[PDB]
Amino acid sequence: IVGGYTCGANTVPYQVSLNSGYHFCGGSLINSQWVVSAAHCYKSGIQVRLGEDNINVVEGNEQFISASKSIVHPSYNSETYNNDIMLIKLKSAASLNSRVASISLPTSCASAGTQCLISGWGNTKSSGTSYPDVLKCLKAPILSDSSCKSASSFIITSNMFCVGYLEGGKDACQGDSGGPVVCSGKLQGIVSWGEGCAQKNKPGFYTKVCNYVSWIKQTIASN
Ligand SMILES: N=C(N)NCCC[C@@H](NS(=O)(=O)Cc1ccccc1)C(=O)NCC(=O)NCc1ccc(C(=N)N)cc1
Ligand SMILES: [Ca+2]
């Protein structure tokens, strides 16, 4: 997260860190047994870390739980990031409390101008590299599709939406991949892709979760 602020320990209780020996992606806890992340975050040997603030220190509210199963979207296409969503089932149910809590799926898509919260342990520099140990947060509006249309040479599909700033300096970034964009108490986005980070007139692109609610519920129900 570039140009954000320190969230405060456990103020984002649905935020998870995916760990394969080190943090490599964010994700969102959607019930006591399942996490939603990005398809591009797919790897073998995922440990899900809940209740995290400082990812380098055991502070006492962490729960580490191995994934039993990962399910990349059936139609995920890595060269376009189309359908960039994956579900991860936990080997055991999380113990829910005030620091480890699920986030609701949306009932409808959110409208442009709505304020959302993006969070993660990703890069904090638009040029160069600094990875934070505590969770970072960024308040960011949904932009009109029209506002972001001309921002890339790469295809932008209807399974993607635009969130962030045209003025530059405020954005999600590498290492934020898979993490939440939450708007009015609903998981509307998944950190997916963008051209660099925090560049002028180059906002980020996020998996449009409101298109996936049927697939998510059905997949959870059958697994
Ligand atoms: N098919 C498409 N759309 N290709 C373009 C996206 C590739 C890549 N962008 S990039 O940051 O690595 C560097 C880049 C690549 C091509 C052109 C300009 C700049 C990228 O984002 N790859 C995945 C990735 O790195 N995701 C992490 C991430 C998280 C947040 C942002 C953000 N600025 N909101 C960017 C990347
Ligand atoms: Ca910790």
Ligand nearest to the CA of 56: 2
Ligand 1 atom closest to 202 (CA): 33
User: Which of 28, 37, 119, 177 is the catalytic position?
Assistant: 177
Q: What pairs with residue 161 in β-bridges?
A: 206
- Domain check: are 4 and 42 in the same one? no
- Domain check: are 108 and 72 in the same one? no
Amino acid 22 reads Y
Contacts of 189 (CB under 8 A, 6+ apart): 116, 118, 161, 163, 180, 181, 182, 183, 206, 207, 208, 209
User: Which of 17, 28, 40, 119 is the catalytic position?
Assistant: 40
Give resolution in angstroms: 1.8
- Domain check: are 64 and 130 in the same one? no
- Domain check: are 47 and 114 in the same one? no
Whether ligand 1 lies within 6 angstroms of the CB of 30 is answered as no
Number of neighbours of residue 9 by Cβ within 10 angstroms: 15
Number of neighbours of residue 130 by Cβ within 10 angstroms: 8
- Domain check: are 77 and 129 in the same one? no
Active site annotation includes 171 = no
Cα-Cα end-to-end distance for the chain: 33
Domain count, the chain: 2
- Domain check: are 83 and 130 in the same one? no
Tokens of 67: 């994934």
Ligand nearest to the CA of 156: 1
Tokens of 192: 């997916």
- Domain check: are 39 and 127 in the same one? no
- CATH code where residue 150 lies: 2.40.10.10
Domain span holding position 177: 1-12+103-210
CA distance 182 to 118: 7
Report how this structure was experimentally obtained: X-ray
